[PDB]
Symmetry: none
Subunit: 306 residues, 4 copies
């Protein structure tokens, strides 16, 4: 009645892995058991970049409990569409290339479509710093020991790309919300007015927004995490992924922590407050439209700021 895989640790079956894909069990297990468990970029970034297949490894989506991509390359014979990631079979596919391993750079130099991540500089090519944080075997974190911050490069049809200037979502939760800057600390520490005062924000309608819904169309309000975090000395909130998939704007079930009383299904975006202030101040208030399109996580998000 099962598709679970086990190991014996003493006279005890512990379930090492459950199969939640359509693939036959042991085929899936192979796939898993070849996950890159070193630092990878996060699913949101790779979706946003339009990446469909990784070179020579497997990116596992730990929330979805399945591999992040349809096929493979030089990994698992029963789903490999190729062996070297330059075979005719995948010229028309944005291929993740991990520059930390040898010879992947030139594989990418010779690829038609792809993105290359690396720990450092690359000869003749302009980087763009990515997030501070990466994904170490499920857990996303910013790390002291291992380096988690990469530089991205993109190719669309023979040609290197200019990657948009972006902000990055901070991949934080409410359970453990840690301030990442002075402004952020202050905001949580101080009282609204004393804050607006200190950072010079009179007549921006700050209080209105941080706490308010700035959705241009996303499902339920668009609230900002650090803003949800401040409304938590009073009765605080539990979150819960509405859909397993990771993305920049994220749908949740918000319910009271203390008692479960339902609230909404609404979207949160976790941004550095500094980056948030910068965008509220970017808005020109003299024009008709109050939609602000900002590019965050290499993707375009539309806001309603007023």
């Amino acid at each position: 009645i099962n598709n679970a895989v086990y190991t014996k640790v003493d006279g005890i079956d512990v379930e090492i892995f459950e199969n939640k894909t359509t693939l036959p069990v042991n085929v899936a297990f192979e796939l898993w058991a070849k996950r890159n468990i070193k630092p990878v970029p996060e699913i949101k970034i790779l979706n946003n970049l339009g990446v469909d297949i990784a070179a020579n490894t497997v990116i596992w989506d730990y929330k979805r409990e399945a591999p992040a991509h349809v096929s493979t390359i030089g990994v698992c014979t029963m789903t490999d569409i190729a062996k070297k990631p330059t075979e005719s079979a995948c010229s028309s596919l944005t291929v993740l290339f991990d520059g930390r391993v040898e010879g992947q750079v030139d594989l990418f130099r010779n690829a038609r479509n792809g993105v290359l991540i690396t720990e450092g500089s690359v000869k003749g090519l302009t980087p763009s710093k990515g997030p501070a944080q990466a994904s170490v075997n499920g857990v996303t974190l910013i790390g002291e020991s291992v380096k988690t911050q990469f530089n991205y490069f993109k190719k669309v049809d023979g040609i290197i790309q200019q990657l948009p200037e972006t902000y990055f979502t901070q991949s934080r939760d409410l359970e453990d919300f840690k301030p990442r800057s002075q402004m952020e600390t202050d905001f949580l520490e101080l009282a609204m007015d004393e804050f607006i005062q200190r950072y010079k924000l009179e007549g921006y309608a700050f209080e209105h927004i941080v706490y308010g819904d700035f959705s241009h169309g996303q499902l339920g309000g668009l609230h900002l995490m650090i803003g949800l975090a401040k409304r938590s000395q009073d009765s605080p909130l539990k979150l819960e992924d509405f859909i397993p998939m990771d993305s920049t704007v994220k749908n949740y079930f918000i319910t009271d922590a203390q008692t479960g009383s339902s609230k909404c299904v609404c979207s949160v975006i976790d941004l550095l407050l500094d980056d948030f202030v910068e965008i509220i101040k970017s808005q020109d208030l003299s024009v008709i439209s109050k939609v602000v399109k900002v590019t965050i996580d290499y993707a375009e998000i539309s806001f309603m700021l007023w």
Copy 2:
């Protein structure tokens, strides 16, 4: 600069304010205000439009000008004498066609929207909404042309505009059906309506009768314990919040034709489980939970 009074010695400049502008130039905007029938602000907002060309668009709901930077309207607020030229082509300019010159300036400017009441050589139109704002009065013209054809450019490129539903713009106070369906819905009880339009075993239930609310459903509930809405925060939003009380919620309401909303309701699976729906309404992508 500002006009002033001399209230015994001396100059006491007089400011609007509501826009902070000198009454002086504030009023010069009211003057040059567009008086021919214009697109409702919500659709301008959605299409992300910045300034109109050689005019002001008035915000009668805010009782202020929709925009305080101008093109060829008032020297104290003009960012440029003419739309198609220099530090100006980055922002999205609304070009109106039923004034001549303008049409030709759209094909020369970078970012911009264009409305017209007929077709234009070589371009594909997208039918706008029936209604338009007429000096603060939103209405469906039969004496005058209020329905436009829209066209948009970004970075130089003509865009294909999405297939859309448009919101109806009805106030509740004087609500009035616009189809056999909307009629029947208000007449028929719940159960009979679900069986006439073969809707049984779909989602809609809560959203229609009683998160997000449908204006038309809110009107049927008005014949039951008459309710009133007042917007704490008055702009013009495709989805608007209202303070809701009786004749003795803070609600998202959307005004949609049932004939359109039931097209939506049916383009799902036979549920009855709650569904995420992503429609284009008023040129903008709306996500909401249907049940």
Copy 3:
């Protein structure tokens, strides 16, 4: 069903599941009244003797049940009292939370208990506890709100002195931050650069940190940071063997990459500086190689070299 729900939108969302002897409605209430502010972890509480909470409910999120058998003035159907000073309590170590008013007071009157406070208390000397607390069952150290308490104990009338203790950090291996300069360079140096930098030759450090210093406990008994370094290249999935929290914790150890077995066995997570202090403390010229250490207020016995 055991399951309690709210309709979020039109969707059944489980907010609570019963895994208790009690009926749903009663357990749910207890859950629903559980203190969700910062609290001492259960290891510290059991180590101390606490068997009941004043006016609150300590919840075990790993065991998904109350931390304690009865209540005081929380829930009419599991209350043994209403006030913590009633004679039905005078034989039980009661947790008194100083951060709320007058609880300090009931603690003076109480004949058996433990009082935590976020600052000094007139007449009594404090035991500066761990840096970390549990906050709605996510154990963390807070810079935002406070997580570090002071402890006091009473045993049948009499004020107590708490032994001086080391405290287990509380760090899963899946996310392991070093908390001192010693831990940083340990992880980021070679063993031999290390032993020298900190002048540790003539202790058989490499033998200890990396090995098994157990006197009895089931499986090996390994330092966490120890495991984290060997983890560096060949990493390990670590998984609770028993829901109950404790100072020395048994685990199912398993390869991360593939699930190959390894063992059941205990880990203890200590600050390296503390560990190094404990090895340096052992007197090498005696028959017994058993070092007893008080950690998290309990006696923990080791085996050294």
Copy 4:
């Protein structure tokens, strides 16, 4: 100080390095080494015994003194002349009741442990193992008394003294059974033992019969395994412990924790844990220490 030689002398002192002591004084230790039959080091270690009074306990596997800290033995190494002084305040000191005077010094001592060949005024004995260590050879005394009665003091307070199993202290080569049960376990096939000593549907299976994969094993279990297809093992490190590691070869099996329990004792352990067949965390007392381990 150290003795020395003269090579183009210049005095050249002489050391070890087993202890680091002057050969000189390391030998005084050898000289004063207790040669009456003393309890096995493991039991001393577990009772947390620090040093012995007016004697030296020798560790033959380490080929050295179990302790370098002395009392009343040697000027260079001791910490007190007499076990009662305030230097032995905080140290568990072994006292013997075979040398008189000491039997009484235990009464006016803080922390310490005492052994005797018979009972003592109004103290409850805990009957120790059958075996002592008689000069590097441990055995069960035929004509000499090797069983002890133990008593312990922590902080002037006479202590609890638990009930214990004891390990049998048997090397594998020279292996001899010590009951009908151990006898049959060697004789009877894998399946026959189970029906005879009615223990079908208990845990016990693996740890008694043998693996590739590695947890605890018991001595006799390994003996039956080499009772054909012989197996060789030896101290990886030369300690003395209730549970010791071995290199099994065999060509290797390889690093096992091994425990030498008399079967009947271990069997009464299996039987104290309701019919299951599921793995079982046992927490038992062996050699006066709480050892916990997984039974399957």
